[PDB]
């Protein structure tokens, strides 16, 4: 199954309650680690992370995250000087990797300024893609350090994947389980002469689900309204798909296909 590991960083200049720096790690949709400039401690966010990593792991990353926190504050100050920006602005980073079902891997590293893409790393060409000329200036500074680019490629292709496999084993009871969806079809005449069909699923894990409507065993032509895959709050998810008007709802989840004929 497709799994991923991601680390996020958020820096806020002159914040309102709101921390100046936040850093959170995720395995798929699950938070695994947290650090902020208020606590000044890296802590686990999943019990299976707390049970499998000794206190020395948390002590070491607490020190690293205090160092990275200061580097983030400084980078945001330089970005604001480049743009001649006053007041409160945000700076974000996302690093991570994916281990696909087919055995192939992906790695990514990107930054955002004020919630918009700023720099995107390409680990295959060892270069940064810049959105504007301030981003272009930072890119020239970062591309001048060949050792750092190579360091990032090795981390994304080897280290991150090894971290992901280790975290998958720790959290296997949560992350590798299957909770099949409970599917129902509801029929209702809405506006005079308009029948609405809703295909609704709930109680499933993982959140990835495929839902579609078919007419006489063939793919629809008319508009299907899709509902977001939402967390139910108990570790499971819910979703829906709807059409107006022989119709059948088709649902695929974790290698099991389901048909609900109307």
């Amino acid at each position: 199954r497709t799994h991923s590991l991601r680390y996020f960083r958020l820096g806020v200049s002159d914040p309102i309650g709101v921390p100046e720096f936040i850093s959170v790690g995720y395995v798929d949709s699950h938070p695994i680690t947290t650090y902020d400039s208020v606590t000044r401690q890296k802590e686990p966010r999943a019990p299976w992370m707390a049970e499998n990593l000794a206190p020395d792991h948390w002590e070491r990353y607490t020190q690293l995250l205090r160092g990275w926190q200061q580097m983030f504050k400084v980078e945001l100050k330089r970005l604001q000087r480049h743009y001649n920006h006053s007041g409160s602005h945000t700076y974000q980073r996302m690093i991570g990797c994916e281990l696909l079902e087919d055995g192939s891997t992906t790695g990514f590293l990107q930054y955002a300024y004020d919630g918009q893409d700023f720099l995107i790393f390409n680990k295959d060409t060892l270069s940064w893609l810049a959105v504007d000329n301030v981003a272009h200036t930072i890119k020239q500074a970062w591309e001048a350090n060949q050792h750092e680019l190579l360091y990032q490629k090795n981390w994304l292709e080897e280290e991150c994947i090894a971290w992901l496999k280790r975290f998958l084993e720790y959290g296997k009871d949560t992350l590798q389980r299957t909770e099949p969806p409970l599917v129902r079809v509801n029929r209702k005449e809405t506006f005079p002469g308009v029948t609405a069909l809703f295909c609704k699923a709930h109680g499933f894990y993982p959140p990835e689900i495929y839902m579609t409507w078919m007419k006489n065993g063939e793919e629809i032509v008319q508009e299907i309204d899709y509902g977001d895959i939402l967390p139910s709050g108990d570790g499971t998810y819910q979703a829906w798909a709807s059409i107006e008007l022989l119709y059948s709802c088709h649902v695929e989840h974790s290698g099991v296909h389901m048909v609900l004929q109307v």
Partner: antibody
Amino acid sequence: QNIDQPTEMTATEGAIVQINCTYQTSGFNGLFWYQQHAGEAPTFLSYNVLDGLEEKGRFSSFLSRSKGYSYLLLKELQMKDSASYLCAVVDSNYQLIWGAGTKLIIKP
Amino acid sequence: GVTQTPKFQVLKTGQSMTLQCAQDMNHNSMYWYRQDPGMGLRLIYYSASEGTTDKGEVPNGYNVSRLNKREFSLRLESAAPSQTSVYFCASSPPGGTDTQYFGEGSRLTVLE
């Protein structure tokens, strides 16, 4: 966890010497080579993180990540090349693990 | 780059000592090591940034102070003959792939 390099090596002036370093670590984020003359401070020689040979004048450093192996190659040896050569690896937690070093003796 | 003092020191057992280290390269990470015959550099304490310090491999018998972004002091509260060694201060630039820059070293000899 562990870094191994020979205690001592002897080679003749004008010749070639290869200083081998093997490591067994939890993760890998880089390999450094440092030079340290007797009674002096260690100074940076090279850094490798991806596979290949990096040439810097008379010195070259090699890395094989799959074998967990590196070498420092010193060509056309000079008496001034007599020093200790320190191998260091960056582990999964970005901490440097230092090897005990190789004392290089050049026979004139 | 990295200024370390004193170069040499003779101490009597039980005596106090402070090793000073300064760098003006605007480095955020600072390290204290001891170098002993037959083994690699052993980290005593380190400072990832100004306002934080943590134990290395051999912190017993020592304590540190990251006084500001430039200075990182090493203290021997009660000098013991096992603390006879060569001490190195190093600093590293914000991030990397980046290398450590070493001070010249301090030879300490502790005698009864």
